[PDB]
Design an enzyme around this catalytic site. Sequence first.
Site, mmCIF file in Angstrom:
data_model
loop_
_atom_site.group_PDB
_atom_site.id
_atom_site.type_symbol
_atom_site.label_atom_id
_atom_site.label_comp_id
_atom_site.label_asym_id
_atom_site.label_seq_id
_atom_site.Cartn_x
_atom_site.Cartn_y
_atom_site.Cartn_z
ATOM 1 N N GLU A 1 32.811 56.054 31.215
ATOM 2 C CA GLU A 1 33.095 55.916 32.641
ATOM 3 C C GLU A 1 32.701 57.175 33.408
ATOM 4 O OE1 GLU A 1 34.923 51.951 32.177
ATOM 5 O OE2 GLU A 1 33.528 53.019 33.479
ATOM 6 N N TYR B 1 38.594 46.853 27.662
ATOM 7 C CA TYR B 1 39.934 47.356 27.964
ATOM 8 C C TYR B 1 41.054 46.342 27.773
ATOM 9 C CZ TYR B 1 37.595 51.376 30.168
ATOM 10 O OH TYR B 1 36.833 52.490 30.433
ATOM 11 N N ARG C 1 29.102 57.012 34.032
ATOM 12 C CA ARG C 1 28.831 55.996 35.047
ATOM 13 C C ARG C 1 29.174 56.407 36.475
ATOM 14 N NH1 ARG C 1 31.779 50.739 32.335
ATOM 15 N NH2 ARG C 1 30.131 50.057 30.889
ATOM 16 N N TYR D 1 28.240 52.080 27.349
ATOM 17 C CA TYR D 1 29.512 51.846 26.669
ATOM 18 C C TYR D 1 29.498 52.149 25.168
ATOM 19 C CZ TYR D 1 34.196 49.723 27.078
ATOM 20 O OH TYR D 1 35.550 49.480 27.140
#
EC number: 3.2.2.22
Length: 262
Positions: A172, A118, A175, A75
Amino acid sequence: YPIINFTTAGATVQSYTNFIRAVRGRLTTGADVRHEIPVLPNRVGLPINQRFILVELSNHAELSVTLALDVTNAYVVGYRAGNSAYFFHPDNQEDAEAITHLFTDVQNRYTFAFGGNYDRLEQLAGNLREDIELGNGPLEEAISALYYYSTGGTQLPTLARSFIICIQMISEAARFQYIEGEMRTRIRYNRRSAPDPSVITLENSWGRLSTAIQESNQGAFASPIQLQRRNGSKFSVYDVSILIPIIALMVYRCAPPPSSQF
Ligand SMILES: OC[C@H]1O[C@H](O[C@H]2O[C@H](CO)[C@@H](O)[C@H](O)[C@H]2O)[C@H](O)[C@@H](O)[C@@H]1O
Ligand SMILES: OC[C@H]1O[C@H](O[C@H]2O[C@H](CO)[C@@H](O)[C@H](O)[C@H]2O)[C@H](O)[C@@H](O)[C@@H]1O
């Protein structure tokens, strides 16, 4: 720290693919793989000199910003633009100390009072992920927005929106091969569109999927995890097998049990 470069200028499926592959290559070490899925380094015992990676983003507008990613979760923890750096509000004292090792030569260091999750970013952006378009165009715009923040050219809502775009297209995507694919498609057809339920639910379930896989009995989940298809309909996950083409790496949750082969 390792640096991986990417530019939205003339981006193609291949250049974006090379970028995400390189990012994953600097995130996992290959020392921890379970059910064929790589696990990120464990926060516990991790030397600070191996804690972060940098992503140098450039765009057609000839602007550049450097995002810092935490190898323990892939992240974004902050970024640098020119003579200024900004970090999301740390979760604890250890992380606050860790980020002091980033962009150490920057003249102006700032720590936001808000976190990079988020929920918080959506509140500040005034829009949910489902209403924020993703693609090369949005990324091009996001890079300029991050760059112009220090001079007052970027409003907070736009800054938050831009973080939401960067995080999904970089973190993301790293990931999940599925999300990387979603961005590849948008690039291939120069289409900008918000993420559908399949993307959103994967993002929201990354932590749980990581735990379920690592705690699984020979790959079998103790309890199913409900995801959503593109149309919003449910998709039940009972085993790690169905996730092989979907999730590329996981956050460390537990120590891998002994091999225990028959
Ligand atoms: O689609 C490939 C191109 O994507 C970017 O440019 C587009 O995004 C801009 C900002 O929204 C639009 O103004 C432009 O019309 C879109 O095509 C990137 O900046 C280009 O270099 C890429 O070729
Ligand atoms: O085993 C080596 C050292 O591990 C610790 O330090 C690492 O892990 C911490 C998180 O658990 C980080 O905060 C720290 O920066 C890393 O170096 C342990 O605390 C030390 O006593 C050990 O020597």
